[PDB]
């Protein structure tokens, strides 16, 4: 049950941490990364108890990327800790950290102040699928956009939904309140069975008037895959 | 027959892969360097079934890069799939991965609103010839691009298509769709035996009202030669 | 005593160093890496005359960063010969410079200009907690703010002081004027048990008109746990 | 005779190859490094045929830079066969391949619409010297320069050239057309024995309008001194 | 006394050279390197003839280097000839070159158009004192800059010497000339013993007019300390 509430509840912060496997990393025996694969898969069920982790191959998909890590935890302290031991496993340490991002859960700021007939659609359940494409894109306003009054941003928040709802269907999302905790103001993530109409929602949303206030709309667009730790790593370990 | 729908379809996935070669490639001996050549080749023959790969030397003619792969898929895992193995290969061991870019071929979305007599000239067949020269140049639009209303961006692409239909004949070209998959909004791509024509067609561009929404224009420009897979890596074998 | 007049007096120098562990330090026995700790911890001791050093995980919470110290000094020519033989201890030689960044504490320019109440608010004593979080930005306004007249920018100082002292509760905060000494006009530092109000503060401040000169905010903005040195190297020994 | 063909006609291409030496190339004995230049010697020899690779001593004078070529040849294939070559040789497996550009020679696009006795002096042979410092200047313009009609660029490189003339006696220039072939529009090459002459012309050319249309001037601007080959690869075979 | 001309007469080139030194360095046992101290000392001495060499402690002040040269030479071909034997030697050998920087000194343009008053005082003679903070900013001026007409340049300048005069007392200026020779037109170098009146010297400057036109205004600022050669490398030997 507890998942869930990482998952869904305010308050929760989530991590975003990618990862790329060393050259030296093959000069290992493979009975050695097989021992190493079981190490990480250790630790993380230890973890277990205070973070969800879930992991997703970007080989393939994502320039200078082969792993992402979405940690929850109530405390970015606990995901510090774990992140540490994770770097210092054996396989950790043939990693060269790539990009790390951070953002907590919240209450919607604009939500409220639309329609009802809108309200009801946010509240439909769109894509439930295992092995999903996984999408993240952080993303950084300009100063014109903070300098707006209250209604001017809930007007330009209500285009930006009425855009991208008909993709509800097939996109599910998740965003992240960033400002603070690093260089951007929101991650947004994104599963979906179907890339073409990931296409269509960001083409969607690219001709609303909020789109021009995103001073940092990507940079990097991180796609992947999915998957549990056991497939991803076992990889590797061949 | 089945290369060509690939090639020529929509809803197919491209995807740019460019490589370049650790200089510890050649502390090998030669033996087991022409190994590892025969490794690569039998993978690419494996997958032949699903995909469409082909091969480019970018060496010597595109900073920091020595090969490139275009590769088609129906579906976006299967290109992680084969680039995952391929990036595991002996020879893909000693690659640095460089740029990765991807993006969907659409139906045409200015076309039908052009002139008759257009349409005809955008149906003529220019280049077919091997080993020609080929180019990849990645592309964003601005903002003010999207803000406009579907009249005044038919018009402008109509602009462009008319500034550049006299190098069809020489120059050979494919656009995908690559918004929310990377950082850029379109990848183009181009064969032709005559750079002069490209570097005049280039220019041609240059001069209508749509280039100036390009926030994008190359970073990198990749230049090659397209050539079978067994000639580049032969190279790296001797 | 002595240690509070360093974190406290005008015209003590605060250097910002960051530095990332090379992947070849995990190849020391760690017998070698017990050694080196060693080393580093005697090397700050005897440099406790002089300076006062403090230290942070960035490890897991900031990109491509392990280690920090916020280094106090009554001259930078003390600081460079710490940093420089920390830098060359065993531990140093496997560590990569990350960013460095230098700042002297001042007397306040806006603060006499402001009413009475508000200098009453900002007196008062607000986080007084071992091992919280620790936020570092860097800051370089533009031309247009220093075009303005002292009148213009002392009250959109005080717009900032306004927007922000609700948090002095549960959020402490240090200027360093680091104009000429490197490439930022100003490195703000931060201590808080709670990011999510850092957080809040940080929003709260990005819709003052102040905010829109801030040419550079960030790039990098760092982010971890204060500790003392030998539970973080400690982490590195194992 | 058909080495001036190369340097002189249009429809030439010209590169631009810079090299860095690794680290590592010292610990190679003093002998395999004479073996070493000797090599690529003669690879030069035998490409003598076909192409003319000019050599440039880049260390010291430019940063992270020790060699250069300008390479000429009327096909592009061939540069990069030769240059894949080179790169293949036991000294180019040391060598950290710096940037890389190319660019068509053209014949003049406004000198038929300059005055009569502005025709005369650009007709002048200038500097004919052995030995000289060599410049290198990229550029890319921005999009109001493309939207400018002809009469009105025709004006502003007539400027151009005005400022520019009195130069003309100790400075001697060359114009590569590269749109297309990378991501600049223009490769400038220039031979002096008076650097401050150089400087001054440069100074007299920022003042002229058409300069604030260069969006990109320099980065790199390449500095060297004019040397052949075995001159520059004797001092690394030391 | 020659080495006075060097240091004030028009004419005189004057290159920045900055080097860091490589993680294997260290593993040379200490005899080889105070054996390569000794390499490098005789070369500066065996120039000593045509150019003067200066050194500077970057090391734990400036980010990503240790060592800097001023060098000045009548003809850059000297100094390039200097630097590439320096970084042949041993010691040089391990230095990874950093950013390199080349300016003329030259009479002044627009100080003969200030009033009478103020050319007295920028005759007055500053700081006089050994082993000094050393600071360089290169700067690149706007296309805006170079448009104004001569008058309304020698009024800005006017106001940019005028704020800076009382300064002149603590710190010592020069300015070379480097448009053409790379990417920057001046590069200002500096000696103070008192860095915080250096700090509000360059905050004065930011607030004339003058000041929006610096396009590019450090990146890097240099910051370090003036120190004799065998100080600065006997650190290394130890
Ligand atoms: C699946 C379709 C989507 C739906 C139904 C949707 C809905 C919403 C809603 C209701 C909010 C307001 C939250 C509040 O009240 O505070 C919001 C905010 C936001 N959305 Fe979306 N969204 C979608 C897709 C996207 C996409 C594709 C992106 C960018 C890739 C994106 C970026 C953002 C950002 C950055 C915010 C924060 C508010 C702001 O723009 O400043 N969303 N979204
Ligand atoms: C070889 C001759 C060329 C022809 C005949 C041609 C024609 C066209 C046509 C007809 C379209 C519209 C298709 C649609 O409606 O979706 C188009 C779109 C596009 N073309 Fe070209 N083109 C040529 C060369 C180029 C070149 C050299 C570039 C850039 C290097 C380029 C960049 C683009 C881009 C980015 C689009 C996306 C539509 C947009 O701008 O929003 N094309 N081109
Ligand atoms: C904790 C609540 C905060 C308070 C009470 C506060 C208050 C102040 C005050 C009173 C000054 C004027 C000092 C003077 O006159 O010299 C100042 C300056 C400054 N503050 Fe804050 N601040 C807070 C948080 C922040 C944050 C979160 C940032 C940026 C991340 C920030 C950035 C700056 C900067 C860069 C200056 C430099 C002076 C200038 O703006 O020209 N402050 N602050
Ligand atoms: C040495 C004295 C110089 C002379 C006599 C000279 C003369 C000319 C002439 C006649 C043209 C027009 C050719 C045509 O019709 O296409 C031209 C173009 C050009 N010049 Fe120069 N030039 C000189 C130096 C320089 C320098 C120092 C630079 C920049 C570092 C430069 C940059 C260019 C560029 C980029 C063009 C391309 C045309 C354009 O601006 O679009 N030239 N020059
Ligand atoms: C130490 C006090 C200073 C004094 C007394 C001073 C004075 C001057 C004078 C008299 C000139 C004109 C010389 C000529 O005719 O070329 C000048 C030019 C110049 N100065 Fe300063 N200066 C000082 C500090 C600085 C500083 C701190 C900077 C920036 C860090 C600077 C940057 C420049 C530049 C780039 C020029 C070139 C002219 C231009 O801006 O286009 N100077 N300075």
Same mark, same amino acid.
């Given at each position: 049950?507890?998942?869930?509430?990482?998952?869904?509840?305010?308050?929760?912060?989530?991590?975003?941490?990618?990862? @790329?496997?060393?050259?030296?990393?093959?000069?290992?025996?493979?009975?050695?990364?097989?021992?190493?694969?079981?190490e990480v898969?250790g630790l993380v069920?230890q973890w277990?108890?205070? &973070?969800?982790?879930?992991?997703?191959?970007?080989?393939?998909?994502?320039?200078?990327?082969?792993?992402?890590? %979405?940690?929850?935890?109530?405390?970015?302290?606990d995901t510090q800790q774990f992140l540490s031991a994770f770097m210092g496993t054996?396989?950790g %340490?043939?990693?060269?950290?790539?990009?790390?991002?951070?953002?907590?859960?919240?209450?919607?700021?604009?939500?409220?102040?639309?329609?009802?007939?809108?309200?009801?659609? $946010?509240?439909?359940?769109?894509?439930?699928?295992? %092995?999903?494409?996984? &999408?993240? &894109?952080?993303?950084?306003?300009?100063?014109?956009?903070?300098?707006?009054?209250?209604?001017? +941003?809930?007007?330009?928040?209500?285009?930006?939904?009425?855009?991208?709802?008909?993709?509800?269907?097939?996109?599910?999302?998740? $965003?992240?309140?960033?400002?603070?905790?690093?260089?951007?103001?929101? &991650?947004?993530?994104?599963?979906? =069975?179907?890339?073409?109409?990931?296409?269509?929602?960001?083409?969607?949303? @690219?001709?609303?008037?909020?789109? +021009?206030?995103?001073?940092?709309?990507?940079?990097?667009?991180?796609?992947?895959?999915?998957?549990?730790?056991? =497939?991803?790593?076992?990889?590797?370990?061949?």
């Open positions: 049950a507890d998942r869930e509430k990482l998952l869904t509840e305010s308050g929760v912060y989530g991590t975003f941490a990618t990862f @790329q496997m060393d050259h030296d990393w093959w000069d290992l025996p493979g009975e050695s990364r097989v021992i190493s694969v079981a898969k069920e277990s108890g205070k &973070i969800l982790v879930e992991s997703y191959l970007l080989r393939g998909l994502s320039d200078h990327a082969d792993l992402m890590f %979405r940690v929850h935890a109530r405390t970015l302290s054996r396989l %340490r043939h990693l060269t950290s790539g990009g790390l991002l951070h953002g907590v859960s919240k209450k919607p700021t604009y939500v409220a102040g639309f329609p009802e007939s809108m309200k009801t659609e $946010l509240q439909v359940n769109g894509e439930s699928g295992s %092995r999903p494409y996984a &999408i993240v &894109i952080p993303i950084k306003k300009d100063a014109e956009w903070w300098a707006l009054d209250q209604e001017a +941003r809930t007007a330009l928040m209500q285009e930006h939904t009425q855009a991208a709802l008909p993709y509800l269907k097939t996109v599910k999302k998740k $965003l992240y309140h960033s400002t603070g905790l690093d260089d951007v103001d929101f &991650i947004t993530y994104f599963e979906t =069975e179907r890339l073409e109409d990931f296409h269509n929602l960001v083409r969607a949303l @690219q001709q609303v008037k909020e789109f +021009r206030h995103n001073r940092r709309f990507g940079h990097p667009t991180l796609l992947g895959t999915m998957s549990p730790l056991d =497939e991803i790593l076992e990889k590797f370990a061949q």
